[PDB]
Write a protein that binds this ligand. Structure first.
Ligand SMILES: Nc1ncnc2c1ncn2[C@@H]1O[C@H](COP(=O)(O)OP(=O)(O)CP(=O)(O)O)[C@@H](O)[C@H]1O
Ligand SMILES: [Mg+2]
Length: 929
């Protein structure tokens, strides 16, 4: 709470208030680098190769070139800051160029920057410039004081918001004082007071304030007074750092990284023990040999995965089948492939948000889409008692809504913040009572039918609330001058308020199991004196005693091709729930019509202080104490339906599921009514085409309505997981092969394992000779995108993890042992291992190893793309031409013997025959189609 006076300039200009300068990282950015790295320092593989780097800091463990040392760590740092440092420096850039934006001061009569701006002084902000800070409107260019504002960057709202000024201060210019409250966090709330001469209090709210990222129009300029200072602005509190996201793939990579660390440590112990424990310094020997074993795999895997994220995001955002998709968190674009649960809303996500009124019932008299003649002639007769009730009901429909019009040649269009009333006005104009232009800021109501033009005006309005479930108005006529109080909303709150009437409950139930969402209308005749004593000013006095008018039933057309999507889902074996705050009867009806339940599948319901339905209170009570047994029940049930849920229990459901099973779930939603279930989700998908947009921009993914996600999960997540699995398999594959090569060399020559490979050879093998086949396999697939619909069942082949486990690691280890051992032993046997021809043995070893890699990458090929087959030939010719001139220091010699090629071909044939035959027999064993 503060008191703002514009005439007391120095007391805020000097100090006591935060300057408009925003600083992010200066003199602390260095302190920022380890702690952020600390999360990366939490993962044991980063620890692993970071200690590999740190080992050579001792001036005794330099075993290879420094060019083999700097490039991996430098390149991984370059990649990992490539995404974030550019954004950080751009943030600093438009922070600095915004804080020097010149602004005119009424008192100082000259332009000053944002730094010189203070609190309480009056600024004329123009149409073509953004609002600098948080202010409150006191005078505008419009005599009414109303203007349209834009906050596309402040919050997720994209439409243009009404903002009125104080009527007392809009006429002004004498000095005017304000009183404000403490800094808060709410993005849709404000409170204040205006004090003028002789202390005349004037109220303030969110309707009369402008914040830091607001954009002005609907005027030329306006006079506004600053309120919040620097850090006190809500953007400094309502914006928080995004939490780190962890995928299961990287966790199991960390696990197998520890496994490989232990394995190579044991191998180093074995080689050192077999050496004879000489040289009197065992520890330096085991450390240097460990580093020699640990210099190929851990760093290459990281960059391969990062390039995988990059190309995967490119492929997602470069599909004609998937128009206008946005990835917002590229840290884990991978877990979508292994998802078992779907948590979703029906509002927009599972619907088209197209509304049509179908049945309306008043006084045991039911009207439908048909029989519009009676209601039409009633409208024409507006300008016995049942007819009067009908026309009054039409009047209440046509007035109480908060819809905005827009004119064109014909079929005048309507937009609002709740489109159910757009459906209402559509029905009313279809009957014959055509509403027209609405000020929605001043008092005007125009309604023309086949007769004569009718005009009203609202005496007072109360906006709808997400908790009040109500909206009420009072309206005065000009033609007949009566006071009509009208109330609209849910019956659950106003049923006891309206009357002691009997015919509400059972009819609401009737249209409930008709699959119709229904709201209810009441009226009351008021007078002038009670209206003005009400206007003297809590909520209790507004509603005293109403009278029921009727109720309406509106249906919605479900989303395009829901049934195909759902059948593809449970032929993919994936599990889907349904949590939404709707009513139980409309929920079961819409799930039946969406074919969420097949034949049979008995439905059970829960109400407390196959299929199953549970209310929100009972959901919280079962998530309250009886947690674990409830979790055990819900996991095995094919479908779960919940009703009457405010988002906190949705977030709790997500948290307890992810914490009690450790699996990856998908939680898709839209609008402000489900903001929590994305921010706590493993993946969040945005919905476009519906009024709500903050959740979609605050999400991680974006699809049109529902369809893309389907093809995003079947054809894209599965392929992503398969190619990542092949990448990991191949990288540990050739790393273990070369490591076993050095190991067998040390067995056959007890000098040192270092003596086999040093220098540029291992550098090029780590970087230049092998990455191109890996990135070629990164693009390879098997099944066309058009064919993923026919065969979703392959999902049931990835839920278990048969490709990433301990046994998979052992299988790849054993295969690598086999091939590396046969190559090394046969080479040493056929080449007569000595110290003179050592160049010949090491050359044929490197050549055979690299060509074996470049052939086995071709073995694991499903489709032969025109862009893929060139990649390995380029590396092959690069190897061929890199021998005589590029390297030309190590392993120099002839090597072009007639018997050399024969021996090489036979040894490679021996090494690649059993795996090729095994793949052929496995293809004969498990034929896909
Ligand atoms: N402006 C409004 N004020 C009060 N209640 C409303 C409303 N618009 C719709 N309702 C009804 O109240 C219930 C909850 O509305 P809420 O304020 O949570 O928005 P919502 O996004 O959940 C609409 P829905 O549930 O139909 O998708 C809905 O079942 C709806 O029928
Ligand atoms: Mg929402």
């Amino acid at each position: 709470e503060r008191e703002i006076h514009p005439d007391t300039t120095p007391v805020y200009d000097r100090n006591r208030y935060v300057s408009n300068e925003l600083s992010n990282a200066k003199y602390n950015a260095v302190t920022f680098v380890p702690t952020l790295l600390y999360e990366q320092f939490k993962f044991f593989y980063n620890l692993y190769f970071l200690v590999v780097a740190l080992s050579q800091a001792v001036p005794a463990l330099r075993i290879g070139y420094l060019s083999s040392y700097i490039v991996p760590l430098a390149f991984v740092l370059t990649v990992t800051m490539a995404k974030e440092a550019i954004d950080d420096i751009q943030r600093r850039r438009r922070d600095r160029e915004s804080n020097n934006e010149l602004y005119h001061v009424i008192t100082r009569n000259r332009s000053i920057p944002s730094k010189d701006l203070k609190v309480g002084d009056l600024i004329k902000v123009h149409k073509g410039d953004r609002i600098p800070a948080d202010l409150v409107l006191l005078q505008s260019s419009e005599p009414s004081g109303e203007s349209f504002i834009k906050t596309d960057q402040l919050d997720g709202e994209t439409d243009w918001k009404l903002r009125v000024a104080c009527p007392l201060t809009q006429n002004l210019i004498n000095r005017i004082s304000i009183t404000a409250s403490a800094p808060e966090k709410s993005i849709h709330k404000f409170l204040g007071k205006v004090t003028y001469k002789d202390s005349t209090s004037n109220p303030l709210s969110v309707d009369n304030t402008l914040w830091a990222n607001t954009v002005l129009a609907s005027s030329g300029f306006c006079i506004a007074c600053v309120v919040y200072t620097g850090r006190d602005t809500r953007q400094a509190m309502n914006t928080t750092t995004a939490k780190v996201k962890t995928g299961l793939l990287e966790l199991e990579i960390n696990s197998i990284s520890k496994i490989l660390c232990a394995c190579v440590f044991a191998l180093s112990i074995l080689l050192v023990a077999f050496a004879g424990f000489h040289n009197d310094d065992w520890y330096i020997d085991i450390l240097r040999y460990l580093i020699l074993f640990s210099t190929i795999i851990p760093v290459s895997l990281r960059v391969n995965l990062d390039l995988a994220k990059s190309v995967y995001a490119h492929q997602i955002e470069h599909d004609k089948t998937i128009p206008e998709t946005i990835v917002r968190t590229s840290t884990i674009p991978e877990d979508l492939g292994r998802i078992e649960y779907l948590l979703s809303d029906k509002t927009g996500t599972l619907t088209q948000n197209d509304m049509q009124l179908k049945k309306i019932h008043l006084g045991t008299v039911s009207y439908t889409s048909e029989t519009l003649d009676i209601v039409s002639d009633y409208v024409q007769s507006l300008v016995k008692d049942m007819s009067f009730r009908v026309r009054d009901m039409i009047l209440t429909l046509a007035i109480c809504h908060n819809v905005t019009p827009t004119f064109e040649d014909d079929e005048l269009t309507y937009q609002a913040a709740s489109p159910d009333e757009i459906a209402i006005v559509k029905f009313t104009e279809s009957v014959g009572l055509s509403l027209f232009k609405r000020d929605r800021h001043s008092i005007s109501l125009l309604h023309e039918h086949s007769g004569k033009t009718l005009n009203y005006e609202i005496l007072q309005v109360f906006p709808f609330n997400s908790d009040s479930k109500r909206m009420g108005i009072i309206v005065r006529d000009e033609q007949l001058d009566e006071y009509w109080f009208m109330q609209k909303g849910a019956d659950t709150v106003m049923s006891k308020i309206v009357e002691s009437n009997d015919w509400l409950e059972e009819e609401t139930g009737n249209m409930a199991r008709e699959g119709l969402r229904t709201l209810v209308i009441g009226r009351k005749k008021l007078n002038k004196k009670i209206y003005e004593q009400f206007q003297k000013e809590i909520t209790k006095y507004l509603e005293h005693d109403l009278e029921l008018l009727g109720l309406t039933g509106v249906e919605d057309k479900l989303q395009k091709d829901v049934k195909s999507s759902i059948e593809l889902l449970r032929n993919a074996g994936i599990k889907i729930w349904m949590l939404t705050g709707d009513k139980v009867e409309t929920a079961r009806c819409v799930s039946i019509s969406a074919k969420l339940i097949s034949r049979g599948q008995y439905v059970h319901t829960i109400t407390k202080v196959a299929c199953l339905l549970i209310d929100g209170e009972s959901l919280g009570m079962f998530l309250k104490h009886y947690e674990q047994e409830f979790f055990d029940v819900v996991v095995h049930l094919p479908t779960v339906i919940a009703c009457r849920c405010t988002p906190q229990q949705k977030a709790d459901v997500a948290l307890v599921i992810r914490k009690m099973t450790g699996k990856r779930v998908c939680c898709i939603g839209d609008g402000g009514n489900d903001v929590s279930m994305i921010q706590c989700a493993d993946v969040g998908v945005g919905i476009v085409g519906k009024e709500g947009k903050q959740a979609s921009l605050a999400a991680d993914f974006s699809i049109t309505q529902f369809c893309h996600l389907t093809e995003l999960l079947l054809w894209h997540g599965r392929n992503s997981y398969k190619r990542s699995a092949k990448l990991a398999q191949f990288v540990m594959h050739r790393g273990l092969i070369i490591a076993i090569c050095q190991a067998v060399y040390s067995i056959c020559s007890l000098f040192e394992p270092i003596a086999l490979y040093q220098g540029w050879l291992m550098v090029g093998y780590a970087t230049c000779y092998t990455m191109a086949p890996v990135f070629s396999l990164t693009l390879d697939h098997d099944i066309e995108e058009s064919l993923t619909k026919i065969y979703p069942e392959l999902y049931k082949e990835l839920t278990e993890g048969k490709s990433l486990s301990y046994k998979t690691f052992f299988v790849w280890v054993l295969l690598s042992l086999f091939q590396g051992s046969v190559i090394q032993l046969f080479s040493q046997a056929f080449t007569s291992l000595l110290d003179t021809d050592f160049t010949r043995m090491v050359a044929i070893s490197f050549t055979a190893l690299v060509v074996n890699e470049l052939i086995m990458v071709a073995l694991e090929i499903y489709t032969w793309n025109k862009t893929m087959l060139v990649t390995e030939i380029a590396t092959l010719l690069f190897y061929i031409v890199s021998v005589p001139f590029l390297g030309d220091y190590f392993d120099l010699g002839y090597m072009t013997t007639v018997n050399y090629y024969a021996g090489l071909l036979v040894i490679l044939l021996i090494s690649i025959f059993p795996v090729w035959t095994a793949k052929a027999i496995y293809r004969r064993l498990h034929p896909p189609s």
